[PDB]
Amino acid sequence: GTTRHVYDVCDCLDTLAKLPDDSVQLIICDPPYNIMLADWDDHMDYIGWAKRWLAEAERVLSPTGSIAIFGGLQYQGEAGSGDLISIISHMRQNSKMLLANLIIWNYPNGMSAQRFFANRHEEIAWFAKTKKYFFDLDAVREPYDEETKAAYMKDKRLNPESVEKGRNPTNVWRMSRLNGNSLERVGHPTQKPAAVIERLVRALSHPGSTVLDFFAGSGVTARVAIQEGRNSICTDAAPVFKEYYQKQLTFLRSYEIVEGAANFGAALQR
Numbered sequence: 689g690t691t692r693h694v695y696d697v698c699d700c701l702d703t704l705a706k707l708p709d710d711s712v713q714l715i716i717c718d719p720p721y722n723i724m725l726a727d728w729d730d731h732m733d734y735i736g737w738a739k740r741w742l743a744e745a746e747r748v749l750s751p752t753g754s755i756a757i758f759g760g761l762q763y764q765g766e767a768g769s770g771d772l773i774s775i776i777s778h779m780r781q782n783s784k785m786l787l788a789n790l791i792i793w794n795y796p797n798g799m800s801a802q803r804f805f806a807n808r809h810e811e812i813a814w815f816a817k818t819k820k821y822f823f824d825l826d827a828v829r830e831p832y833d834e835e836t837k838a839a840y841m842k843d844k845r846l847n848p849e850s851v852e853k854g855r856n857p858t859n860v861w862r863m864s865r866l867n868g869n870s871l872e873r874v875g876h877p878t879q880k881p882a883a884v885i886e887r888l889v890r891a892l893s894h895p896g897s898t899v900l901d902f903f904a905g906s907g908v909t910a911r912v913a914i915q916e917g918r919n920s921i922c923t924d925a926a927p928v929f930k931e932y933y934q935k936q937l938t939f940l941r942s943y944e945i946v947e948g949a950a951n952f953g954a955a956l957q958r
């Protein structure tokens with residue numbers, strides 16, 4: 689089961705434009721939440737820009753595909769910026785995709801605050817293209833310890849199968865963010881931990897399927913895809929992305945790495 693991974697530096701719309709309809713199983717999306725100065729030539733707000741890649745993302749997703757969008761709920765109203773809610777409202781009005789879950793990523797540490805409740809969460813909006821979306825709950829269930837598992841097994845009111853398979857991790861994930869001394873750190877300011885991406889990849893895509901990330905950043909998605917047996921396409925507009933991707937690889941089974949948007953097909957093949 690040799691997987692293929694293509695990467696390149698380019699704008700998200702240029703990546704998406706080269707991808708055929710219903711060719712991708714899962715999209716990992718952790719977008720910037722502000723437009724560029726030049727973007728003011730064609731847009732009046734964040735969504736005016738974001739709607740373009742959101743529509744394109746839905747197009748390349750297969751009938752069984754899903755997209756996980758990272759974002760916060762602290763938007764302050766600045767012109768040209770927005771947050772996950774700006775995206776969700778837009779989707780409710782213009783997209784047929786189903787919001788399967790609004791996941792809360794609750795991290796342990798963070799800054800303090802004297803005038804409000806210290807922020808300890810970030811969200812993940814999981815949109816499924818259709819009601820036939822793929823979902824592998826068993827792949828992400830959290831096992832019970834032997835003691836607790838033994839107690840439940842004695843409770844005949846409970847289904848023994850559910851017990852041995854573990855519990856649903858729920859839509860609130862208590863996971864840590866990366867620290868400045870983390871091993872997987874590559875230098876990217878908003879690098880996401882492999883742990884969070886892994887849960888998304890295992891539950892929202894099947895083995896050998898294609899995972900797409902057009903705001904790849906640190907390239908963590910490709911690393912996870914490779915470790916999980918999926919194919920992947922990772923692109924970012926920042927040239928430095930190439931350095932991070934290469935770094936991700938050093939942290940690493942049969943897989944092939946291919947550079948160049950002209951080779952996207954290599955990762956689309958089942």
Ligand SMILES: C[S@@+](CC[C@H](N)C(=O)[O-])C[C@H]1O[C@@H](n2cnc3c(N)ncnc32)[C@H](O)[C@@H]1O
Binds near residue numbers: 718880906923925926
């Ligand atoms: C929040 S970061 C993604 C971080 C990623 N989840 C990680 O774990 O490293 C957003 C990324 O989008 C890129 N970006 C911004 N505008 C873009 C555009 N028009 N096309 C492609 N990438 C863009 C930035 O360079 C940045 O790396």
Ligand SMILES: [Cl-]
Binds near residue numbers: 788789790791859
């Ligand atoms: Cl929910």
